[PDB]
Design a protein around this ligand. Structure first.
Ligand SMILES: Nc1ncnc2c1ncn2[C@@H]1O[C@H](COP(=O)(O)OS(=O)(=O)O)[C@@H](O)[C@H]1O
Ligand SMILES: Nc1ncnc2c1ncn2[C@@H]1O[C@H](COP(=O)(O)OS(=O)(=O)O)[C@@H](O)[C@H]1O
Ligand SMILES: [Ca+2]
Ligand SMILES: [Ca+2]
Ligand SMILES: [Ca+2]
Ligand SMILES: [Ca+2]
Ligand SMILES: [Ca+2]
Ligand SMILES: [Ca+2]
Ligand SMILES: [Mg+2]
Ligand SMILES: [Mg+2]
Ligand code: NA
Ligand code: NA
Ligand code: NA
Ligand code: NA
Ligand code: NA
Ligand code: NA
Ligand code: NA
Ligand code: NA
Ligand code: NA
Ligand code: NA
Ligand code: NA
Ligand code: NA
Lengths: 510, 510
């Protein structure tokens, strides 16, 4: 289908002959420079390659507000997610319209030249409410208030080069490249499958059903740009995708990585995803249950209805110009050993089975055995390997402040005690001295599977520098993960409590 | 590197706007039509896509003879293998120079329009001797005298479309497409690996060593056009390649299928292969032991020296314009568990191991266990699956002419006897009635693993219609595979001889 807006805005192609010139300007000592934030690197790449057609830069206030309140660009073009260049007051103050800014990656690789149209201060509360539904726990809202700059810079782009990537060079196909891929294969019907999670059996069946329904080839188009916090890293997922793609009949599916930065904006994002997939050459786009939805908030309430996305996409059906293949909950049928859309069964006459993502991590963290019917063996192997069970996970024991015993001797005791257990885990007494360059290394070790014994707490002003993952506090306080009887409890006693606690949480298995 | 001759002769690209016109001419009732033979379909595809640059058609007598006696085109361009359009006297007589012939595939798909330059009758004996070294058992020579037409038609081509293929649509990359593939990946150094056999551990090591020596990425460029008779079909090999490619580090190798029709012309072919890979975008080409060699003849003598190809390629080194990575016998080192070029070991100080292709089939046909060191498990699995052991192979028992007993009763006896053995094999009394439409089906069944009991022989004039594979003759004659005592030997006796013969040859296992 024709790219959204009618013209694929591949600016790399467009500006080719200005490459050298733009590059010179980008590195001229006079031009103002802004180093792109991670999400911005994702967005900038989708803008320059045509993935965000008709966009050709970051939204000015006129187009931005029109998207917030109208799900459309100022000219009426259907567009639900605002793509803006967020900066800080300090930087915002150095620019005026007509100004040319050089956009860099890692304060080293010049990506593009942005010609300023305007500099405004968005009302983040409206964007949060109208665009992401207002809930403060929503991933896009939390980003908007805690990471995003408070000033947006609307302006047009001139491409120097797409952001740099050293992993999967062959797989990050651009819209132009994907289209050629499909053509060389004479693929004129292609249903695209969005995803940010590893694909299990349900998904494989879902995608094949779609290929059959639409009479089209399958395009696995996963997001490797930025997804929901806590998601499985993309490297692991790519390994999973490349593995599961082999379960499809020969020459029916194609894999391509999408460097998109999701907002987990349920229904709006679904519309957005469809527009993006259309730009990339897809003729069909799948939209299953809770598409692009971030689940429930701490109160247990849904951020979106399980089918809001489908409803929203349905209402823009006649102007999306890409056919949507909707799916209802796809579940497992024990008694028949096969999956099927929930909308064509039940009646109690048939029993179903479903292993939610939650329950999935549990087995992964507890060494549980994931059902042969749920996912392929090769896939679980890859997953377990990236997210090992507790007995192979790292951790830290922080000797609380209330501790009255010798921190030095208690540290040694714990070290010697853990050492006798064996199991391949590496241990270390870790003195941070409140130095962030040491604090920031704590999760690195934990990530490496090592066990750390930290004799002292770090000042509260630095608590943010350390990831709380698998970090336990040994203290007399009520907020201690491992609570002590008294501040001067004898070491052997404290040691037994720490050992049994870790044993109870699966870190040790005898 | 620059395509051989300086210009990539991608005629599909060149003639694009003449597509409709040429197609109309190709289907005009007045034009003369020739249906391309299989090998011609392979050649025609390599000429039209630029793989045979500078060629732009089938060699006229001038260029043809220059290649036979000079390993060069008339203009001096280095070219060792003659690419000609062979036809029969009947067809040759209907054409004169300046004539335009329509070249079809399956007497249905118009491939191109050939403009006649000349029609000559080559001296096949010279071509056989100067180009293929003369031995009558040489694959290219046997084809030249038993399959090829006795008349060649030199002339230029105008492409309508490359030959049709419904398998591996994405993998049969054209020179232009491969070059783009490499570029999108920023691959400026690529060492290509030719092959017509499944890749085992030795090859994987060989190719990686090459990647490391040349400091280049790996291109697995296997032949799926036409190879040595008796080779493993390409479908199986592709499955093997796709499987083994996964044993390479991520993003170091690329797979592309080459629809080439080999001539098994050792050294000359090596030169030719190098030219071909250069046209396809490779910067390096591997040339190991007995490259493109058909082994030995029935007398046990080599068609080519194990390193003739390397020597020939070496002598054209300065004009091939593509770097050749030569390899000496790569063998296995038990004591060190690793492979290595034979030129850098031996001295008896180290023991080697080598499982020749011969010995390889033996295990495959005998259910033997192929060593973990020799090939990957996943690969052998695929191989055994395509070339099952005797206990899963089909066969036929032909009741010889000398048979005096009731052919009807002996047939039933054999059927009832084989049936009691079980093992998944399907049996059938097969009456051919000397009808070729029935005879041509015999190998189909054997190929399907079934066991056939044929009560009568077929006239000698039709013996050619039947593949002799796993077809045994039960007769009193000395040329009988299963020799009987007397023409009227009692059935139960004949039955025991047949059963024990099949049991001795592994078809039955109890
Ligand atoms: N059980 C299911 N039934 C129907 N659709 C599903 C199911 N599981 C996942 N999907 C669909 O698969 C696509 C991607 O799934 P996920 O990676 O889990 O999440 S999403 O954030 O990319 O939407 C979405 O269209 C989603 O709705
Ligand atoms: N043991 C080996 N040592 C060195 N080179 C080898 C070895 N085996 C195969 N090769 C090389 O691998 C390439 C393809 O091998 P084959 O498929 O067996 O045959 S070929 O007809 O295509 O050459 C050739 O360059 C060949 O010489
Ligand atoms: Ca703020
Ligand atoms: Ca719910
Ligand atoms: Ca006390
Ligand atoms: Ca003849
Ligand atoms: Ca020899
Ligand atoms: Ca007798
Ligand atoms: Mg990039
Ligand atoms: Mg083809
Ligand atoms: Na369209
Ligand atoms: Na730097
Ligand atoms: Na449809
Ligand atoms: Na709803
Ligand atoms: Na439309
Ligand atoms: Na507990
Ligand atoms: Na026909
Ligand atoms: Na002679
Ligand atoms: Na070199
Ligand atoms: Na020789
Ligand atoms: Na050169
Ligand atoms: Na024997």
């Amino acid at each position: 289908p024709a790219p959204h807006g009618g013209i694929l805005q591949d600016l790399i192609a467009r500006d080719a002959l200005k490459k050298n010139e733009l590059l010179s300007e980008a590195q001229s000592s006079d031009i103002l420079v802004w180093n792109l934030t991670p999400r911005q690197l994702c967005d900038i790449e989708l803008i320059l390659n045509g993935g965000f057609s008709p966009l050709t830069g970051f939204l000015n206030e006129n187009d931005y507000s029109s998207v917030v309140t109208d799900s459309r660009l100022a000219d009426g073009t259907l567009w639900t997610i605002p793509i803006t260049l967020d900066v800080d007051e300090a930087f915002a103050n150095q620019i005026k319209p007509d100004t040319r800014i050089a956009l860099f990656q890692d304060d080293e690789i010049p990506i593009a030249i942005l010609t300023v149209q305007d500099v405004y201060k968005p009302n983040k509360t409206i964007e949060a409410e109208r665009v992401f539904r207002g809930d403060p726990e929503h991933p896009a809202i939390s980003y908007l208030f805690n990471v995003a700059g408070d000033y947006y810079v609307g302006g047009s782009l001139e491409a120097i080069q797409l952001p740099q990537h050293y992993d999967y060079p062959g797989l990050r196909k651009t819209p132009a490249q994907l289209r050629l891929e499909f053509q060389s294969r004479q693929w004129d019907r292609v249903v695209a499958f969005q995803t940010r999670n590893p694909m299990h059996r349900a998904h494989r069946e879902l995608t094949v059903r779609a290929a059959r329904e639409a009479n089209a080839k399958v395009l696995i188009h996963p997001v490797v740009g930025l997804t929901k916090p806590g998601d499985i890293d993309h490297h692991t997922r790519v390994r999973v995708y490349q593995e599961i793609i082999k379960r499809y009949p020969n020459g029916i599916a194609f894999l391509s990585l999408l460097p998109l930065a999701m907002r987990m904006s349920g229904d709006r994002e679904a519309v957005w995803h469809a527009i993006i997939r259309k730009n990339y050459g897809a003729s069909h786009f799948i939209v299953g249950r809770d598409h692009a939805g971030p689940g429930k908030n701490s109160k247990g309430v849904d951020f979106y209805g399980p089918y809001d996305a489908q409803e929203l996409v349905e209402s823009y059906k006649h102007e999306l110009d890409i056919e949507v293949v909707p799916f209802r909950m796809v579940t497992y049928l024990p008694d028949e050993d096969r999956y099927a859309p929930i909308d064509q069964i039940d009646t109690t006459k048939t029993r179903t089975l479903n292993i939610s993502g939650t329950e999935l991590r549990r087995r992964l963290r507890v060494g549980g055995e994931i059902p042969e019917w749920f996912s392929y063996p090769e896939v679980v192997k890859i997953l377990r390997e990236s997210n090992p069970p507790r007995p192979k996970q790292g951790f830290s024991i922080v000797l609380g402040n209330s501790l009255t015993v010798s921190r030095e001797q208690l540290s040694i005791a714990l070290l010697s005690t853990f050492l006798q257990f064996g199991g391949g885990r590496y241990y270390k007494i870790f003195e941070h001295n409140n130095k962030t360059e040491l604090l920031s290394l704590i999760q690195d070790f934990i990530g490496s599977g090592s066990g750390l014994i930290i004799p002292d707490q770090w000042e509260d002003d630095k608590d943010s520098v350390v990831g709380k993952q698998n970090v336990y506090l040994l203290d007399t306080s009520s907020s201690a993960d491992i609570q002590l009887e008294s501040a001067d409890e004898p070491i052997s006693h404290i040691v037994q409590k720490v050992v049994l606690f870790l044993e109870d949480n699966g870190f040790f298995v005898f």
